[PDB]
Amino acid sequence: AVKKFKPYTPSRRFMTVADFSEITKTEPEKSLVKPLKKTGGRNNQGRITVRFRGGGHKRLYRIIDFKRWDKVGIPAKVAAIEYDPNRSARIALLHYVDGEKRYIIAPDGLQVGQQVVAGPDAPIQVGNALPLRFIPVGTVVHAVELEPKKGAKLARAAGTSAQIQGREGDYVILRLPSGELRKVHGECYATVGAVGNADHKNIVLGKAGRSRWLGRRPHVRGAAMNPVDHPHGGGEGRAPRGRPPASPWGWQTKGLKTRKRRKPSSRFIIAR
Amino acid sequence: MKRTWQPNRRKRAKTHGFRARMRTPGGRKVLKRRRQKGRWRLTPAVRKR
RNA sequence: GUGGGAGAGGGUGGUGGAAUUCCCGGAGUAGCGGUGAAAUGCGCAGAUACCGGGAGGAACGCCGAUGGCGAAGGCAGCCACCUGGUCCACCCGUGACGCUGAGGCGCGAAAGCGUGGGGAGCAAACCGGAUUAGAUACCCGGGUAGUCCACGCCCUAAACG
RNA sequence: GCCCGGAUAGCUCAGUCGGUAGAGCAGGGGAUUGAAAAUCCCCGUGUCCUUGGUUCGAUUCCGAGUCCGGGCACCA
RNA sequence: GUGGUUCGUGGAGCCAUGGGGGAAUCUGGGCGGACCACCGCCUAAGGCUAAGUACUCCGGGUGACCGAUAGCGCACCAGUA
RNA sequence: CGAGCUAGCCCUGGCCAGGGUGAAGCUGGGGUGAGACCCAGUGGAGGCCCGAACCGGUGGGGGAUGCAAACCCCUCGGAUG
RNA sequence: CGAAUGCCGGCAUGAGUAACGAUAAAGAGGGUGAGAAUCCCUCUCGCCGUAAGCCCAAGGGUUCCUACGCAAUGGUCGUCAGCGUAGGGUUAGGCGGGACCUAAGGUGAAGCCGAAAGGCGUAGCCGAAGGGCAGCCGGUUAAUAUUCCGGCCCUUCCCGCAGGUGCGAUGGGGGGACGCUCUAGGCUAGGGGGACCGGAGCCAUGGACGAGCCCGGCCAGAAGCGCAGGGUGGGAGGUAGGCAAAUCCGCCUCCCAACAAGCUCUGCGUGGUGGGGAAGCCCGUACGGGUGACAACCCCCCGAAGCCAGGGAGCCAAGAAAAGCCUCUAAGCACAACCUGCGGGAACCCGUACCGCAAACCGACACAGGUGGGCGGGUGCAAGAGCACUCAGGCGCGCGGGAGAACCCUCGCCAAGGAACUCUGCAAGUUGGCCCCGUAACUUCGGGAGAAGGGGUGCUCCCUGGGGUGAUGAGCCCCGGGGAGCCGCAGUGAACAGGCUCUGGCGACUGUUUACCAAAAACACAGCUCUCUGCGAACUCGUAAGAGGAGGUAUAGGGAGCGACGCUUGCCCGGUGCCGGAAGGUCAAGGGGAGGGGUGCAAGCCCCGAACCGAAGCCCCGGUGAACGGCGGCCGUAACUAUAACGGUCCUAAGGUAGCGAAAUUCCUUGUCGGGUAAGUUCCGACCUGCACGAAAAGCGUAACGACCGGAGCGCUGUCUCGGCGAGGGACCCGGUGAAAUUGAACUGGCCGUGAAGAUGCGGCCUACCCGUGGCAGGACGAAAAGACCCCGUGGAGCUUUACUGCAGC
RNA sequence: UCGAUGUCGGCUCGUCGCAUCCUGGGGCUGAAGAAGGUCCCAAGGGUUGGGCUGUUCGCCCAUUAAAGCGGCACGCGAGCU
Ligand SMILES: [K+]
Ligand SMILES: [K+]
Ligand SMILES: [K+]
Ligand SMILES: [K+]
Ligand SMILES: [K+]
Ligand SMILES: [K+]
Ligand SMILES: [K+]
Ligand SMILES: [K+]
Ligand SMILES: [K+]
Ligand SMILES: [K+]
Ligand SMILES: [K+]
Ligand SMILES: [K+]
Ligand SMILES: [K+]
Ligand SMILES: [K+]
Ligand SMILES: [K+]
Ligand SMILES: [K+]
Ligand SMILES: [K+]
Ligand SMILES: [K+]
Ligand SMILES: [K+]
Ligand SMILES: [K+]
Ligand SMILES: [K+]
Ligand SMILES: [K+]
Ligand SMILES: [K+]
Ligand SMILES: [K+]
Ligand SMILES: [K+]
Ligand SMILES: [K+]
Ligand SMILES: [K+]
Ligand SMILES: [K+]
Ligand SMILES: [K+]
Ligand SMILES: [K+]
Ligand SMILES: [K+]
Ligand SMILES: [K+]
Ligand SMILES: [K+]
Ligand SMILES: [K+]
Ligand SMILES: [K+]
Ligand SMILES: [K+]
Ligand SMILES: [K+]
Ligand SMILES: [K+]
Ligand SMILES: [K+]
Ligand SMILES: [K+]
Ligand SMILES: [K+]
Ligand SMILES: [K+]
Ligand SMILES: [K+]
Ligand SMILES: [K+]
Ligand SMILES: [K+]
Ligand SMILES: [K+]
Ligand SMILES: [K+]
Ligand SMILES: [K+]
Ligand SMILES: [K+]
Ligand SMILES: [K+]
Ligand SMILES: [K+]
Ligand SMILES: [K+]
Ligand SMILES: [K+]
Ligand SMILES: [K+]
Ligand SMILES: [K+]
Ligand SMILES: [K+]
Ligand SMILES: [K+]
Ligand SMILES: [Mg+2]
Ligand SMILES: [Mg+2]
Ligand SMILES: [Mg+2]
Ligand SMILES: [Mg+2]
Ligand SMILES: [Mg+2]
Ligand SMILES: [Mg+2]
Ligand SMILES: [Mg+2]
Ligand SMILES: [Mg+2]
Ligand SMILES: [Mg+2]
Ligand SMILES: [Mg+2]
Ligand SMILES: [Mg+2]
Ligand SMILES: [Mg+2]
Ligand SMILES: [Mg+2]
Ligand SMILES: [Mg+2]
Ligand SMILES: [Mg+2]
Ligand SMILES: [Mg+2]
Ligand SMILES: [Mg+2]
Ligand SMILES: [Mg+2]
Ligand SMILES: [Mg+2]
Ligand SMILES: [Mg+2]
Ligand SMILES: [Mg+2]
Ligand SMILES: [Mg+2]
Ligand SMILES: [Mg+2]
Ligand SMILES: [Mg+2]
Ligand SMILES: [Mg+2]
Ligand SMILES: [Mg+2]
Ligand SMILES: [Mg+2]
Ligand SMILES: [Mg+2]
Ligand SMILES: [Mg+2]
Ligand SMILES: [Mg+2]
Ligand SMILES: [Mg+2]
Ligand SMILES: [Mg+2]
Ligand SMILES: [Mg+2]
Ligand SMILES: [Mg+2]
Ligand SMILES: [Mg+2]
Ligand SMILES: [Mg+2]
Ligand SMILES: [Mg+2]
Ligand SMILES: [Mg+2]
Ligand SMILES: [Mg+2]
Ligand SMILES: [Mg+2]
Ligand SMILES: [Mg+2]
Ligand SMILES: [Mg+2]
Ligand SMILES: [Mg+2]
Ligand SMILES: [Mg+2]
Ligand SMILES: [Mg+2]
Ligand SMILES: [Mg+2]
Ligand SMILES: [Mg+2]
Ligand SMILES: [Mg+2]
Ligand SMILES: [Mg+2]
Ligand SMILES: [Mg+2]
Ligand SMILES: [Mg+2]
Ligand SMILES: [Mg+2]
Ligand SMILES: [Mg+2]
Ligand SMILES: [Mg+2]
Ligand SMILES: [Mg+2]
Ligand SMILES: [Mg+2]
Ligand SMILES: [Mg+2]
Ligand SMILES: [Mg+2]
Ligand SMILES: [Mg+2]
Ligand SMILES: [Mg+2]
Ligand SMILES: [Mg+2]
Ligand SMILES: [Mg+2]
Ligand SMILES: [Mg+2]
Ligand SMILES: [Mg+2]
Ligand SMILES: [Mg+2]
Ligand SMILES: [Mg+2]
Ligand SMILES: [Mg+2]
Ligand SMILES: [Mg+2]
Ligand SMILES: [Mg+2]
Ligand SMILES: [Mg+2]
Ligand SMILES: [Mg+2]
Ligand SMILES: [Mg+2]
Ligand SMILES: [Mg+2]
Ligand SMILES: [Mg+2]
Ligand SMILES: [Mg+2]
Ligand SMILES: [Mg+2]
Ligand SMILES: [Mg+2]
Ligand SMILES: [Mg+2]
Ligand SMILES: [Mg+2]
Ligand SMILES: [Mg+2]
Ligand SMILES: [Mg+2]
Ligand SMILES: [Mg+2]
Ligand SMILES: [Mg+2]
Ligand SMILES: [Mg+2]
Ligand SMILES: [Mg+2]
Ligand SMILES: [Mg+2]
Ligand SMILES: [Mg+2]
Ligand SMILES: [Mg+2]
Ligand SMILES: [Mg+2]
Ligand SMILES: [Mg+2]
Ligand SMILES: [Mg+2]
Ligand SMILES: [Mg+2]
Ligand SMILES: [Mg+2]
Ligand SMILES: [Mg+2]
Ligand SMILES: [Mg+2]
Ligand SMILES: [Mg+2]
Ligand SMILES: [Mg+2]
Ligand SMILES: [Mg+2]
Ligand SMILES: [Mg+2]
Ligand SMILES: [Mg+2]
Ligand SMILES: [Mg+2]
Ligand SMILES: [Mg+2]
Ligand SMILES: [Mg+2]
Ligand SMILES: [Mg+2]
Ligand SMILES: [Mg+2]
Ligand SMILES: [Mg+2]
Ligand SMILES: [Mg+2]
Ligand SMILES: [Mg+2]
Ligand SMILES: [Mg+2]
Ligand SMILES: [Mg+2]
Ligand SMILES: [Mg+2]
Ligand SMILES: [Mg+2]
Ligand SMILES: [Mg+2]
Ligand SMILES: [Mg+2]
Ligand SMILES: [Mg+2]
Ligand SMILES: [Mg+2]
Ligand SMILES: [Mg+2]
Ligand SMILES: [Mg+2]
Ligand SMILES: [Mg+2]
Ligand SMILES: [Mg+2]
Ligand SMILES: [Mg+2]
Ligand SMILES: [Mg+2]
Ligand SMILES: [Mg+2]
Ligand SMILES: [Mg+2]
Ligand SMILES: [Mg+2]
Ligand SMILES: [Mg+2]
Ligand SMILES: [Mg+2]
Ligand SMILES: [Mg+2]
Ligand SMILES: [Mg+2]
Ligand SMILES: [Mg+2]
Ligand SMILES: [Mg+2]
Ligand SMILES: [Mg+2]
Ligand SMILES: [Mg+2]
Ligand SMILES: [Mg+2]
Ligand SMILES: [Mg+2]
Ligand SMILES: [Mg+2]
Ligand SMILES: [Mg+2]
Ligand SMILES: [Mg+2]
Ligand SMILES: [Mg+2]
Ligand SMILES: [Mg+2]
Ligand SMILES: [Mg+2]
Ligand SMILES: [Mg+2]
Ligand SMILES: [Mg+2]
Ligand SMILES: [Mg+2]
Ligand SMILES: [Mg+2]
Ligand SMILES: [Mg+2]
Ligand SMILES: [Mg+2]
Ligand SMILES: [Mg+2]
Ligand SMILES: [Mg+2]
Ligand SMILES: [Mg+2]
Ligand SMILES: [Mg+2]
Ligand SMILES: [Mg+2]
Ligand SMILES: [Mg+2]
Ligand SMILES: [Mg+2]
Ligand SMILES: [Mg+2]
Ligand SMILES: [Mg+2]
Ligand SMILES: [Mg+2]
Ligand SMILES: [Mg+2]
Ligand SMILES: [Mg+2]
Ligand SMILES: [Mg+2]
Ligand SMILES: [Mg+2]
Ligand SMILES: [Mg+2]
Ligand SMILES: [Mg+2]
Ligand SMILES: [Mg+2]
Ligand SMILES: [Mg+2]
Ligand SMILES: [Mg+2]
Ligand SMILES: [Mg+2]
Ligand SMILES: [Mg+2]
Ligand SMILES: [Mg+2]
């Protein structure tokens, strides 16, 4: 379900906006928002370390809960479902029965009203979070932790999910959004379900400006520069690549693998 | 056109000020030098009030 | 209307085992494939063949029929739910309400097409090996789209009785 | 105009350490067929482009010349 | 592995030391240009030590030094306008 | 030593006369088994249109020891992004 | 010292020359004074008026006011001045900032890093055109005024009274608190009108003594009262959350209440009282005073973009923080404290003049440039900040007088023709607004479209339908509709305001760029593919700490190419890249030491050192094309000829598929044919022999878009035949002021020759009295820049890579 | 001539040569006439307007008495483009 426009302007022909139906609250929960310092892609030296970043709508960080176990066994009521402009996924405002309000990243299905809770107990239901070991094999799950107590860091982007495939001692065999087969510790929490807002991948920004709203300044091809600037700089008209394609920093960029070989997590990966 | 000199009393002192010089060690030599030479003013003259 | 049937009729959601392929483990040695015969291919960097563990997809052996259902196209593992047509019995109810049907509207195999997803087997195109005078074919080794799902198109047929 | 390469059987081409040059196809004579083809058996003609030289001897080595093909003919 | 020394890897010792290994108290240890013997010379891994040496912001004395385009950038209210 | 010019980004403020066009959504009517859709009204979207401010700098003329070390006149581009 | 485009200084030439800095514009009378176009004053004239007026901010820093001055500064003049000399001038509890808050950022206890210097860094602190916070209207000075004075009104601190109540933090919680577009109600600012109120006066020139003309008819105001609107449920129980504790907030369950009310809060009207108060006329002011007056002070209409304001609706890109403030409890204290009234007292530092779209700021200048926010009246024109005029206000641009040439510039008209001009309709025309009618191919269905093309447009009288405000009524507004008629060459009568079409290329589009010769077909762009990247991600900056990535997590992030969209995107993996290969070769330090060597009388001590064990890399084996890349030759053959579907053979990793094709690519070439034209190197359609297209350095198309680039036509025209006239600003003459590059020195002619090969300068001849003014550009191989092309230099720089050697990195 | 001698074409303005394109005069003719041919004298004047291309050139359109060729730094950018 995605919004389209009639072509009453060039660039409305193809523009497409998310259907905002599952959205329930519109202003966010004040006691749960910080201002986020916008970098423009600049590091603590005043120096761009990520090109073509900046501008883009002013935003307000929603502090969201990626460690669910700091409230084991207290249920919560899904109070709202609202837009969070700091991620692709939509956040669920929930209301704990001891009165604490916290932000969850909303799974698919989860509707205003239901109960949610996290702990070893935790019925196997969408919204609930459990140490991985007590999650039925083959369940699809999201917001996984990579190591225990370090907080969810996996399958959080709109429509993502991992699948529990098997177990080996303290480690369960996970299939990540990227098809890769990782062992992950059992005491790693994970809330069950997939992430939802799955149509996300179907919006069509439509015009140069929509990119600009998202903090994305134009991106200029190596081809388009001169050789001071870039390996593909120069030539007379137009120039084939001329060499193994490369980055402004000169490294190969069609194939050249960069994950460090010696990396200790090598031991717990099995895929691609 | 718009020329290059666009006076700003705050910018002038933030940038060439005595305090500014004494922060960086390069600046303290800039002072060290203007003293050792006799310059009547070590830092540019500005005007807060 | 009332009571009943038979049924691979349709839609949905689940679920089972055989087999193929790939992966890991174990044990094992020089061939395995393939064909008319071959070659290409695969294999001591440990293949084929055998055991165990897993992953994934697609199709449902026996039952099975010259059988059944559907208007047609078509439909076949099993389970539930939702749902269409039909048949019989009984002779209760309406009372000619019937037949057909130009246009309209809906369904409509396969291939194809769009957006996603999926991808084990198979396989247009394509590549090799062969055969031939040539072989842009038939046979062989590989192989993409497609084949599968969802939504939306296309509307064809020896859509045949 | 400038430099590189090539020129061998009818056609397309290997090839040589200086001495007797081959491959496929075409062609020829036989066979098979009713007849052609495909198949099969047997058969090369070559003055190795022209010219001059090196040699005992040159298709083979050398210098030129035709001819063909390829690159170049830039600042102007 | 380097630096220092005349020593640019050279027969490359001596002094120093980032890395590794790692002792002994005089019958101990370092040195005399690889190394060995011999014969000598020294006493590592704690510290201090005037003077003789260098310099001229400052004061003075001199000049086969300048004399206002010279001499300091400045003889004058110049590191100023 | 410089980002008081210029380039980009960050924080916090401000600005854009007046006209046009009339998207979706609504609401009614039609339609149908239900729908799709159709028509009207409302509505007031847009790197939408005309045009000042403002931002520009197309073409032409002028200037060329200039008014001006890039200006002027006519003309033209954007003008809710 | 004679040369170094030498250095410093002086003074010449060009020269009384160019210039005197917007073509808004001047004239006179009077006055002052040694002296006046330039200063004062009056009268007339012109110019600005979304400014060329007025108010803040920044900058500048005495320029402000006055008196006395004119050497210089002023593009002339100067009696004047933004100049000289002196003297005066800037008043705040409420305006701005500070004894308040936080933002990015800066700084920075703790703590981390780094040879040194220093780099980072949670808290804290700093940091504002953001939050917060108490003054409005008049009057007065030569010059300040929300600052002084008047009237009216507030804030905070201290100390009292009285009355309240568990008080009490830097801790908890609420609030503060937030986008963009559209926007209702009710007001206010501001305006227009009045037959009404007030007012000096007026009756001209034919008429008018009129409900005539002219002028004005308000401003501030506490409490309370109204009219608008904002914000907010009330109670009770439970409680594990809000890093202690809460009675607060949060969550739960009860109840009453609920489109309100009530409580608050703000705006607006009113309101004690206070102020203002025209034109005109007379005052002597460079300008202010007197009077007008006991001024009046009312009604109606328009109406904000401002106010009520945290209002409402829609939308996606999802819209600061901290304090002040309210609540809550902790220690501590409750003979404290706080809250509420009302009283007295206390209330500091800094700024304040003037300029401020400009002669005071940035541009070396009294520079036609640049400079942020607010106000910016009236009438008309469909609207408006547009356009014309014009109010308040301000100005005529700090050289003038004449003249009436060329020529230049800006501008107006042109008979006939109408693009014949030319690289090109360059330029200039035409067209222009609003209303109505009407509008094609093609299309992505929105568009194309203002397509095209037409008709209308003023004024007068009669009829007449709606709105708004009043009241349903009058008046005042607004949107109209019908019919008669009038005058001109002309009714958007001035001013502002598209020329149109057809057909190609390129780019889809809006955007972006070479500040200052290129705005584009270039860049970007949604979108598509490839690839890396499992998170202490990859990548980027940094020696490091750290940081960006990202408070993100494969629907995400980096890199590369392609560039909406449609239909597509072929074959080649031999070489190069990348990917995969737990075997094999090779392979450095290391290990290991067969076996030698040097020395010692030996025990030793010290060197070499063969196997063999040794990684990555390379080789090797495979993969890989939206990875770098590549994508053939010759000969023959058909029953007229021609041509070759077909065959033969050499070579290759493989031999270019669809589409397209003399093209932004085609050399021959103006290819050939067809179309347009009387004529077409261009353009369009074709053909294919593609010198040397061809598929994501994408291929072929594509509606729409374009200050791109091309061909054509229609309209119109001084572009042209081919010029004429005219206006103004210069040029020219006179008065004032007065430069510049350049310059060996000059007494500086023509020809034919000669000369280092292009002579004022030599020869011969010929011409020629001395000196200027306006003009033109043939020559002084005229000026200007130590040629920018070319070469040279064992000169330099940017850039490339399978050049060398290295270093970072891996 | 590199301490600079601006370079094609167009425009404008010409001027000179004559080996003459026209006009004028002539000899010869395979000159009946008329029209030509060829060569001689002659430089006084004349020598068009368009399409195409930056073009010079050239080719074409329509004319004409004719539609001359060369030089002057392939005349002329302190004259323009
Ligand atoms: K790009
Ligand atoms: K390029
Ligand atoms: K056969
Ligand atoms: K197969
Ligand atoms: K496949
Ligand atoms: K059938
Ligand atoms: K059948
Ligand atoms: K060969
Ligand atoms: K042969
Ligand atoms: K040494
Ligand atoms: K030692
Ligand atoms: K020694
Ligand atoms: K010694
Ligand atoms: K000492
Ligand atoms: K002197
Ligand atoms: K000096
Ligand atoms: K509508
Ligand atoms: K609109
Ligand atoms: K000199
Ligand atoms: K002079
Ligand atoms: K003037
Ligand atoms: K006005
Ligand atoms: K003077
Ligand atoms: K001046
Ligand atoms: K005087
Ligand atoms: K502030
Ligand atoms: K508090
Ligand atoms: K708070
Ligand atoms: K008023
Ligand atoms: K003041
Ligand atoms: K004159
Ligand atoms: K012409
Ligand atoms: K009325
Ligand atoms: K217009
Ligand atoms: K395209
Ligand atoms: K520049
Ligand atoms: K443009
Ligand atoms: K560009
Ligand atoms: K972050
Ligand atoms: K290849
Ligand atoms: K390869
Ligand atoms: K390969
Ligand atoms: K062609
Ligand atoms: K080509
Ligand atoms: K033609
Ligand atoms: K353009
Ligand atoms: K001249
Ligand atoms: K050399
Ligand atoms: K010269
Ligand atoms: K030269
Ligand atoms: K003649
Ligand atoms: K003549
Ligand atoms: K030509
Ligand atoms: K020349
Ligand atoms: K010129
Ligand atoms: K020229
Ligand atoms: K000249
Ligand atoms: Mg907050
Ligand atoms: Mg810094
Ligand atoms: Mg470029
Ligand atoms: Mg750079
Ligand atoms: Mg490079
Ligand atoms: Mg390149
Ligand atoms: Mg370039
Ligand atoms: Mg190229
Ligand atoms: Mg990967
Ligand atoms: Mg300057
Ligand atoms: Mg001093
Ligand atoms: Mg059934
Ligand atoms: Mg079924
Ligand atoms: Mg195995
Ligand atoms: Mg049934
Ligand atoms: Mg009956
Ligand atoms: Mg009956
Ligand atoms: Mg079908
Ligand atoms: Mg199908
Ligand atoms: Mg698919
Ligand atoms: Mg041959
Ligand atoms: Mg011979
Ligand atoms: Mg050394
Ligand atoms: Mg050496
Ligand atoms: Mg030693
Ligand atoms: Mg020794
Ligand atoms: Mg010795
Ligand atoms: Mg003396
Ligand atoms: Mg001196
Ligand atoms: Mg002297
Ligand atoms: Mg001096
Ligand atoms: Mg700046
Ligand atoms: Mg900046
Ligand atoms: Mg726009
Ligand atoms: Mg404004
Ligand atoms: Mg401005
Ligand atoms: Mg500007
Ligand atoms: Mg311009
Ligand atoms: Mg010009
Ligand atoms: Mg404009
Ligand atoms: Mg516009
Ligand atoms: Mg914006
Ligand atoms: Mg001299
Ligand atoms: Mg002097
Ligand atoms: Mg002097
Ligand atoms: Mg002169
Ligand atoms: Mg003159
Ligand atoms: Mg003059
Ligand atoms: Mg006068
Ligand atoms: Mg006078
Ligand atoms: Mg005026
Ligand atoms: Mg105006
Ligand atoms: Mg003014
Ligand atoms: Mg100031
Ligand atoms: Mg100044
Ligand atoms: Mg003054
Ligand atoms: Mg003077
Ligand atoms: Mg003055
Ligand atoms: Mg003065
Ligand atoms: Mg204050
Ligand atoms: Mg104090
Ligand atoms: Mg603070
Ligand atoms: Mg710091
Ligand atoms: Mg403030
Ligand atoms: Mg204040
Ligand atoms: Mg006053
Ligand atoms: Mg004043
Ligand atoms: Mg006042
Ligand atoms: Mg309390
Ligand atoms: Mg309103
Ligand atoms: Mg008022
Ligand atoms: Mg009005
Ligand atoms: Mg009035
Ligand atoms: Mg009276
Ligand atoms: Mg009279
Ligand atoms: Mg009267
Ligand atoms: Mg009267
Ligand atoms: Mg009032
Ligand atoms: Mg009031
Ligand atoms: Mg309540
Ligand atoms: Mg309680
Ligand atoms: Mg607590
Ligand atoms: Mg209320
Ligand atoms: Mg009085
Ligand atoms: Mg609101
Ligand atoms: Mg604070
Ligand atoms: Mg003031
Ligand atoms: Mg002024
Ligand atoms: Mg002012
Ligand atoms: Mg202003
Ligand atoms: Mg002024
Ligand atoms: Mg002024
Ligand atoms: Mg002014
Ligand atoms: Mg002036
Ligand atoms: Mg100015
Ligand atoms: Mg100035
Ligand atoms: Mg105005
Ligand atoms: Mg107004
Ligand atoms: Mg107006
Ligand atoms: Mg108008
Ligand atoms: Mg006036
Ligand atoms: Mg002016
Ligand atoms: Mg003037
Ligand atoms: Mg005319
Ligand atoms: Mg005419
Ligand atoms: Mg005409
Ligand atoms: Mg023409
Ligand atoms: Mg034009
Ligand atoms: Mg007009
Ligand atoms: Mg048409
Ligand atoms: Mg339309
Ligand atoms: Mg129209
Ligand atoms: Mg029209
Ligand atoms: Mg009329
Ligand atoms: Mg009239
Ligand atoms: Mg073309
Ligand atoms: Mg474009
Ligand atoms: Mg536009
Ligand atoms: Mg554009
Ligand atoms: Mg430029
Ligand atoms: Mg440039
Ligand atoms: Mg620009
Ligand atoms: Mg430049
Ligand atoms: Mg230009
Ligand atoms: Mg330009
Ligand atoms: Mg980090
Ligand atoms: Mg990306
Ligand atoms: Mg990217
Ligand atoms: Mg591109
Ligand atoms: Mg490898
Ligand atoms: Mg090995
Ligand atoms: Mg070794
Ligand atoms: Mg060893
Ligand atoms: Mg290796
Ligand atoms: Mg290989
Ligand atoms: Mg390709
Ligand atoms: Mg033609
Ligand atoms: Mg042309
Ligand atoms: Mg290409
Ligand atoms: Mg390609
Ligand atoms: Mg392209
Ligand atoms: Mg094309
Ligand atoms: Mg197109
Ligand atoms: Mg003319
Ligand atoms: Mg004239
Ligand atoms: Mg005139
Ligand atoms: Mg003169
Ligand atoms: Mg004069
Ligand atoms: Mg000179
Ligand atoms: Mg001569
Ligand atoms: Mg002589
Ligand atoms: Mg002579
Ligand atoms: Mg003269
Ligand atoms: Mg010259
Ligand atoms: Mg030179
Ligand atoms: Mg030069
Ligand atoms: Mg240059
Ligand atoms: Mg060199
Ligand atoms: Mg060199
Ligand atoms: Mg010279
Ligand atoms: Mg002659
Ligand atoms: Mg005759
Ligand atoms: Mg002549
Ligand atoms: Mg002549
Ligand atoms: Mg002609
Ligand atoms: Mg020549
Ligand atoms: Mg010549
Ligand atoms: Mg020439
Ligand atoms: Mg000339």
mmCIF file with all atom_site columns, C-alpha atoms (C1' of nucleotides) and ligand atoms in Angstrom, chain G residues 18-20 730-732, ligand 105:
data_model
loop_
_atom_site.group_PDB
_atom_site.id
_atom_site.type_symbol
_atom_site.label_atom_id
_atom_site.label_alt_id
_atom_site.label_comp_id
_atom_site.label_asym_id
_atom_site.label_entity_id
_atom_site.label_seq_id
_atom_site.pdbx_PDB_ins_code
_atom_site.Cartn_x
_atom_site.Cartn_y
_atom_site.Cartn_z
_atom_site.occupancy
_atom_site.B_iso_or_equiv
_atom_site.pdbx_formal_charge
_atom_site.auth_seq_id
_atom_site.auth_comp_id
_atom_site.auth_asym_id
_atom_site.auth_atom_id
_atom_site.pdbx_PDB_model_num
ATOM   1 C  "C1'" . A  G 1 18  ? 41.229 64.370 -22.536 1.00 0.00 ? 18  A  G "C1'" 1
ATOM   2 C  "C1'" . A  G 1 19  ? 38.659 65.030 -18.556 1.00 0.00 ? 19  A  G "C1'" 1
ATOM   3 C  "C1'" . C  G 1 20  ? 35.546 67.767 -14.314 1.00 0.00 ? 20  C  G "C1'" 1
ATOM   4 C  "C1'" . G  G 1 730 ? 29.425 64.902 -26.276 1.00 0.00 ? 730 G  G "C1'" 1
ATOM   5 C  "C1'" . A  G 1 731 ? 32.426 66.802 -30.070 1.00 0.00 ? 731 A  G "C1'" 1
ATOM   6 C  "C1'" . C  G 1 732 ? 33.274 72.602 -31.515 1.00 0.00 ? 732 C  G "C1'" 1
HETATM 7 MG MG    . MG I 2 .   ? 36.136 69.036 -23.432 1.00 0.00 ? 105 MG I MG    1
#
